[PDB]
Amino acid sequence: LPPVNTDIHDWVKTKGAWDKGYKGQGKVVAVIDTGIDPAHQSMRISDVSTAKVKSKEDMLARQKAAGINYGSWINDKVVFAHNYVENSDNIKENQDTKYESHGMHVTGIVAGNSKEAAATGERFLGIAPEAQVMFMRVFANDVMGSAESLFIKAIEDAVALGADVINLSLGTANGAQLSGSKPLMEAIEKAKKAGVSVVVAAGNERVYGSDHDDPLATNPDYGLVGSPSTGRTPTSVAAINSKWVIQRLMTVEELEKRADLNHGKAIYSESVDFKNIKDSHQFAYVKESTDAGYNAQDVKGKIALIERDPNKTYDEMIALAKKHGALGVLIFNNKPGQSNRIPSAFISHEFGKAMSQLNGNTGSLEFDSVVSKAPSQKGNEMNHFSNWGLTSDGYLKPDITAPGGDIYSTYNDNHYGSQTGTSMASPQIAGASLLVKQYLEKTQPNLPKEKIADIVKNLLMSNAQIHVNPETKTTTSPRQQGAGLLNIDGAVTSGLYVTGKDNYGSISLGNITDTMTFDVTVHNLSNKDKTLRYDTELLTDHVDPQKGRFTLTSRSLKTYQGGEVTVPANGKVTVRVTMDVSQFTKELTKQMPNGYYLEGFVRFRDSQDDQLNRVNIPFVGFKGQFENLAVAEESIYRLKSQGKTGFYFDESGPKDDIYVGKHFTGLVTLGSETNVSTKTISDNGLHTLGTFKNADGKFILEKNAQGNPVLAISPNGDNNQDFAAFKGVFLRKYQGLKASVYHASDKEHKNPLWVSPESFKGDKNFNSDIRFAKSTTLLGTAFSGKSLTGAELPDGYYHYVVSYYPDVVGAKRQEMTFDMILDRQKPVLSQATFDPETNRFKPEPLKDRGLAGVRKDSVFYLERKDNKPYTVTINDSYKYVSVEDNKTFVERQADGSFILPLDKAKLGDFYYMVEDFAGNVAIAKLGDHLPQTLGKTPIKLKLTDGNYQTKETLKDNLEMTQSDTGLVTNQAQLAVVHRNQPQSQLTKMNQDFFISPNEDGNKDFVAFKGLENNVYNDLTVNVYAKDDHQKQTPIWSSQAGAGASAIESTAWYGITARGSKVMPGDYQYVVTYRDEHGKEHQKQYTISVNDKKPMITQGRFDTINGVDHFTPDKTKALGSSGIVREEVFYLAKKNGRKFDVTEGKDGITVSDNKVYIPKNPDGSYTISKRDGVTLSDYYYLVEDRAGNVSFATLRDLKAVGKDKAVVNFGLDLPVPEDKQIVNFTYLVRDADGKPIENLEYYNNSGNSLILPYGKYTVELLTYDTNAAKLESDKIVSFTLSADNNFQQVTFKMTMLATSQITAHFDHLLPEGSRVSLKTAQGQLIPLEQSLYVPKAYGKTVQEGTYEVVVSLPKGYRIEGNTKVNTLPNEVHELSLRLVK
């Protein structure tokens, strides 16, 4: 037999358990992952009668009557396999980089058992080579709502089929331990109680900031360690790099004598473009000194090249090579570490640095093939990416380390390969957990299956070897390490483990003051006894003082020592540790002002002659208050007012540029230009509030005469800065977030005038790579100068207050306040002086009406081009038209005047414009109020604003007659190609009282219009809910000052007073007013609100006189979704596009080049073939009673053959289509239960299938199980046929809403208090003490109504408001006061 590779086995000390009789034998590991190739030579058991599952037949006996009839035993080794996405039995993936498979690799690492040699000549075995493997193919892609469904199945199926150990590989960054994802936790917890060890990789995100910079020393909460592994039950696995690596190295035969360089290894660089074997047998190395040009006439050409000097990586000190020839190049570090390095490639790789200088012979060179085991350049170091820090709620995770870096394991088709990550360290602890269970299953069968897996964890952890950072000769932080490195031997032999106060092999202490005090308990498992001597190291983060950022390492403070203990036999012994750290406080809190970690280990050696019975337990606490670290970064406004900057803020380009795409905390608003020659038809997008377009169009944060910026919005209707909304850079995970507005005289923020209707939660912005956002904008925090009742809040000075909480159960609410001006008033245009001889135009000094200041005045004329004063510009690629003025600007003299080049345009045609900080702009056209008798001598010129900036009004042509209902709404066509806003106009509404409040232009609101010579005094509109049958409590009311005219004052947009869309359903719209004489009048109407785009059937197509005829299926007219318009049209091509601009009286409007086809008497439409118009330019379109519109090309309505049918699946949620789940997956099965293959989709919806006629079922597979829950049948059956050739299937669901509840107390509670939430219906939700705020008891809960009950001992009471009616996404604090 060939030799065994022990690179990872020597190091984890695994052979110590094999030789004691513990291979994988008689156990089985469930590997939930991406794929296997159960045929691989490694996939084998030695003796099949030693095994848990004994044959293909012991399986079906275990499948059935445990309750499962999918997926099969495949061989003795891979004992169960099922592909839980798509519900199939294709298990192997993937059908250079070929053959690679993640789940194959994972299994290779946990179970054995190759008796053939890999590329090195060695046999590779897993940590438990004699275990059988069930493998669940489960992996996510976000077309679904949530993969949790599929994981829980795989888990439950694992526990029921053959239990033992599950290896998960799954993670969501910065998880919590307590408020994890409930249905997945319970499934994990269920497995523990069945004796299953659940081990989970901890993540590859490393720490907050990891793809940007090291975290600032003010922000200690940089933990990225993932759920579900952050849970208390599972085993969270950090990853250390392998000391030995297996690659395709290099060899310089001339350096074979040099023995610190492996005799030619250098590994390889090869980044981005991996063209190592482009031009690479080889020869002809070179030698280059400087990275300049022609250093010494080069000397390359068909020869590799050599340099550093970090001047310009990958471009100037890379592409400069192919210049002097050389057919390839070779870089070396400028220190000993081997970093990573458009492409601009000939051939290039990075190779060591100690081997750079050793290349000092020119020389010859070869690029090795096959794999040759070489020493890792990252050796005994913690892998860069292994997750760290605490859980989101402040718990010590990970739990243990194991080799994750450059781990050699199994690939498909008898191949092997190296892949790196915490995903790989986890199967090391998977196998190790197999073995330590055999051990306890032999050592104590007097041990229950419910306490078993918690101890396998505790043995592995206490017996771990505390890692020491090589580059720094300091212990690596337990927040990065766990309880240490995996010591398999130590775990199965020592029979000692350690718990702390919490009864866990780790200790999280919460905050700490000056005296760290905690009880440690050592446990004995054998009959013989041990007497051990203990001492504790005490560590904190090291921070670099040049830049003020952590260095992701530690420094030792003082090793305090305690003494010796003597554990009993089959017994415990407690110990008390105590340390005064009051000493180190000044030095540390000066380096880390918001607090620091005080962590470390306590070690246990055998008293006489240590190294026998070496065991440890880790601890961490926080000096400060971990509950109250700042959740958000400070606003870019405050930071820049001081000299500071943001963690992700790019200060590139002009001073004080805050481009809106730039990752800060701040306020965002919408911009819209102001045009004097034509109507503005589109807006300019978001920009940062208080920034303004400077000369070169960069957005600068401009300052008022006192040196401050101004946050001001103008909630007029003009779309220039009408709202403000919060954008955040989050440091910690957030909860409870809302925006509130108070008047600024209300200094304590006790009377909200406006609150954002929703409250928000989310993740820290940890930016671990490009896929992870550095800022998040929450547009649902938009404030628009309206109150909680819809009233306009008057111009003035207000506070916009964004408040939130962290995810720690006792934390106190953090606020963050923005000074905010509402100012809706244009600045003043009075007068100026112009001098025909000097031509100097001087306006009065600049005044504003309102609190926002004047921000800039300008003079401009309209540079006519191609006979028009504006420039209409058509974006062909994005099907968009924009049009703005040709403003050319007159420079402004330092004295505040302009010289007006009257050669370029007349005097009448200059405009003076003054704009303010809130977006109001005044523009006077000089020609207004200018005497025609000019050109003589100084004048006083009157200026008035010309209302160029104004809110647009709907075209209103309507003449009301008595017969008219009085209701009006709007009308618009739905664009098919162009992405401009289709022009809309007012229409009567005397039937079909249905609205689609979707702001598309068409039936969006219900207004009321009165007869023109009738009087409507005190006209108000109130909308009542269907339930409110006495019409007592409006849900929306018109604002004050409404009449028959200004229909906008009566327009109801399907919303509540607070601005949120109402639910689908029907509502009483009541118009009330007083008379000509004095009589009261009340018209009442039933308005019905409905979104939901129509569903378009296939129709059919027949050929008639050699021309295509399309006949649509008969539209149904009943209901709100009944169809009331029906069009077939095509799009003509004019000027080479399918839309068109037309310049009208009003302004410019954009339209599709629609040509309609009449209906024929046989209900068909004749589809002529005409020059340049194909079937993809013919459309069917339908409008419902509500104004909802759908359309499809006629090309898409074919590909439904005349013998085939269509089924469409969708979810029916009782909410507005903008607050709905849309993501789910489904399996369709044919008459025999076989899944359908070879899917054709219909009208471009992945939810609509073309299928042959027959009987079928569909199964709702996955949906967002946290967002919504299913209420209708999960499996629905349907039959397709020529009569029923279109089938709707609908999964009916309800929305889920959660809230957090915290009971905060006066004083601590006596021992023996049991806090619980009492639900209506009487049940008890037990609560537990907060770790950081021990007078707090909190939980996240379903939106409902609860009471806090405590049940104290021997006599005390609680005395406070204990009842709360919970709101969705709110945090409710119920402070409570115990007394005696």
Q: Which does 1225 bind (CB under 5 to 8 A by kind): Cl ion, Ca ion, none?
A: none
| 286: exposed, middle or buried (Cβ count in 10 Å: 0-12, 13-18, 19+) | buried
In the Cβ-directed half-sphere of 1218, how many Cα atoms lie within 13 Å?
13
Q: Which does 377 bind (CB under 5 to 8 A by kind): Ca ion, Cl ion, none?
A: none
Q: Which of 37, 393, 1000, 1108 binds Ca ion (CB under 5 A)?
A: 1000
Contact present, 188 and 79 (Cβ < 8 Å): no
Q: Which helix (H) or strand (E) holds 160?
A: helix 148-161
Position 369, amino acid:
S
Which residue, 177 or 996, has its beta carbon nearer to Ca ion? 996
Q: Residue of minimal CB distance from Cl ion?
A: 850
Q: Which does 1164 bind (CB under 5 to 8 A by kind): Ca ion, Cl ion, none?
A: none
Q: Which of 381, 606, 627, 848 binds Cl ion (CB under 5 A)?
A: 848
Show the tokens assigned to 548: 């003020």
Contact present, 283 and 364 (Cβ < 8 Å): yes
Is residue 384 annotated as part of the catalytic site, yes or no? Answer: no
Helix orientation angle between 452-462 and 422-443, rounded to the nearest 10 degrees: 110
Is 915 a binding residue for Cl ion by CB under 5 A? The answer is: no
| Nearest alpha-carbon partner for 920 in 682, 672, 667, 691 | 672
Q: Which of 401, 1002, 1121, 1287 binds Ca ion (CB under 5 A)?
A: 1002
Q: What is the chain's alpha carbon radius of gyration, rounded to the nearest angstrom? A: 37
Category of 564 on φ-ψ map: left (φ > 0), alpha (ψ -120 to 50) or beta: beta
Q: Which does 850 bind (CB under 5 to 8 A by kind): Ca ion, Cl ion, none?
A: Cl ion
Q: Which residue has the tokens 């888990």?
A: 155
Which residue, 378 or 764, has its beta carbon nearer to Ca ion? 764
Which residue, 697 or 845, has its beta carbon nearer to Cl ion? 845
Is 223 a binding residue for Ca ion by CB under 5 A? The answer is: yes
Q: Which does 164 bind (CB under 5 to 8 A by kind): Cl ion, Ca ion, none?
A: none
Angle at 1055 between CA 778 and CA 666, to 5 degrees: 20
Show the tokens assigned to 820: 């905010």
Is 269 a binding residue for Ca ion by CB under 5 A? The answer is: no
Smallest distance, Ca ion to C-beta of residue 224, A:
4
Q: Which of 6, 684, 825, 833 binds Cl ion (CB under 5 A)?
A: 825
Is 853 a binding residue for Cl ion by CB under 5 A? The answer is: no
Q: According to CB under 5 A, which residues from 325 to 364 bind Cl ion? A: none
Catalytic residue among 227, 229, 348, 423: 423
Catalytic residue among 82, 102, 467, 799: 102
Q: Which does 225 bind (CB under 5 to 8 A by kind): Ca ion, Cl ion, none?
A: Ca ion
Q: Which does 916 bind (CB under 5 to 8 A by kind): Cl ion, Ca ion, none?
A: Cl ion
**How many CB atoms within 10 Å of residue 65?**
9
Is residue 33 annotated as part of the catalytic site, yes or no? Answer: yes
Show the tokens assigned to 1280: 């397709």
Q: Which of 225, 907, 975, 1249 binds Ca ion (CB under 5 A)?
A: 225
| Nearest alpha-carbon partner for 889 in 913, 853, 909, 861 | 861
Q: Of the listed pieces 794-802, 914-922, 1014-1022, 1031-1039, which binds Cl ion according to CB under 5 A?
A: 914-922
Q: Which does 945 bind (CB under 5 to 8 A by kind): Cl ion, Ca ion, none?
A: none
DSSP 3-state assignment of 288?
A: coil
Report the alpha-carbon distance of residue 718 to residue 703 in Å, rounded: 24
| Nearest alpha-carbon partner for 928 in 944, 917, 948 | 944
Contact present, 632 and 550 (Cβ < 8 Å): no
Phi, psi at 1278, each rounded to 5°: -150, 155
Which residue, 76 or 916, has its beta carbon nearer to Cl ion? 916
Q: Could you tell me the CA-to-CA distances from 281 to 284, 366, 525, 605 in Å, in that order?
A: 11, 5, 59, 54
Report the alpha-carbon distance of residue 1148 to residue 517 in Å, rounded: 76
Q: Which does 1373 bind (CB under 5 to 8 A by kind): Ca ion, Cl ion, none?
A: none
Is 716 a binding residue for Ca ion by CB under 5 A? The answer is: yes
Q: Of the listed pieces 459-467, 483-491, 1155-1163, 1180-1188, which binds Ca ion according to CB under 5 A?
A: 1180-1188
Binding mask 166-185 for Ca ion (x = CB under 5 A): --------x-----------
Smallest distance, Cl ion to C-beta of residue 792, A:
16
Show the tokens assigned to 1118: 């009943």
Smallest distance, Ca ion to C-beta of residue 983, A:
14
Is 720 a binding residue for Ca ion by CB under 5 A? The answer is: yes
Q: Which does 897 bind (CB under 5 to 8 A by kind): Ca ion, Cl ion, none?
A: none
Is 298 a binding residue for Cl ion by CB under 5 A? The answer is: no
Q: Which residues are annotated as a binding site for Ca(2+)?
A: 223, 225, 235, 625, 627, 714, 716, 718, 720, 722, 743, 746, 823, 825, 848-849, 915-916, 996, 998, 1000, 1002, 1004, 1304, 1343
Smallest distance, Cl ion to C-beta of residue 825, A:
4
Size of the site for Ca ion (CB under 5 A): 17
Smallest distance, Cl ion to C-beta of residue 853, A:
8
Q: Of the listed pieces 144-152, 340-348, 804-812, 852-860, which binds Cl ion according to CB under 5 A?
A: 852-860
Q: According to CB under 5 A, which residues from 970 to 999 bind Ca ion? A: 996, 998
Report the alpha-carbon distance of residue 468 to residue 453 in Å, rounded: 28
Which residue, 766 or 1337, has its beta carbon nearer to Ca ion? 766
Which residue, 7 or 848, has its beta carbon nearer to Cl ion? 848
Q: Could you tell me the CA-to-CA distances from 844 to 816, 898, 928, 940, 1280 in Å, in that order?
A: 39, 12, 17, 11, 79
Q: Which does 823 bind (CB under 5 to 8 A by kind): Ca ion, Cl ion, none?
A: Cl ion
Q: Which of 181, 227, 392, 920 binds Cl ion (CB under 5 A)?
A: 920
Catalytic residue among 33, 37, 489, 1108: 33
| Nearest alpha-carbon partner for 70 in 50, 55, 54, 90 | 90
Q: Which of 600, 850, 919, 1034 binds Cl ion (CB under 5 A)?
A: 850
Is 1152 a binding residue for Ca ion by CB under 5 A? The answer is: no
Smallest distance, Cl ion to C-beta of residue 1338, A:
46
Which residue, 83 or 920, has its beta carbon nearer to Cl ion? 920
Q: Which of 350, 406, 915, 916 binds Cl ion (CB under 5 A)?
A: 916
Report the alpha-carbon distance of residue 1345 to residue 16 in Å, rounded: 57
**How many CB atoms within 10 Å of residue 839?**
15
Q: Helix, strand, coil % (nearest 5) of the chain?
A: 10, 35, 55
Size of the site for Cl ion (CB under 5 A): 7
| Nearest alpha-carbon partner for 1127 in 1102, 1090, 1092, 1154 | 1154
Position 49, amino acid:
S
DSSP string, 226-274: PBTTTSSSSEEEEEEE-SEEEE--EE-GGGSS-GGGTTS-------SS-
Phi, psi at 1041, each rounded to 5°: 80, 60
Q: Which of 33, 657, 823, 1183 binds Cl ion (CB under 5 A)?
A: 823
Is 224 a binding residue for Ca ion by CB under 5 A? The answer is: yes
DSSP string, 310-359: TTSTTTTTTTHHHHS--S-EEE--SSSS--------SSEEE--SHHHHT-
Which residue, 376 or 714, has its beta carbon nearer to Ca ion? 714
Q: Which of 404, 919, 966, 1338 binds Ca ion (CB under 5 A)?
A: 919
Phi, psi at 1210, each rounded to 5°: -160, 165
Smallest distance, Ca ion to C-beta of residue 841, A:
27
Which residue, 162 or 919, has its beta carbon nearer to Ca ion? 919
Residues forming contacts to Cl ion in the complex (CB under 5 A) are 823, 825, 848, 850, 852, 916, 920
| Contacting positions for Ca ion (CB under 5 A) | 174, 223-225, 714, 716, 718, 720, 722, 919, 996, 998, 1000, 1002-1004, 1187
Tell me the catalytic residues: 33, 102, 423
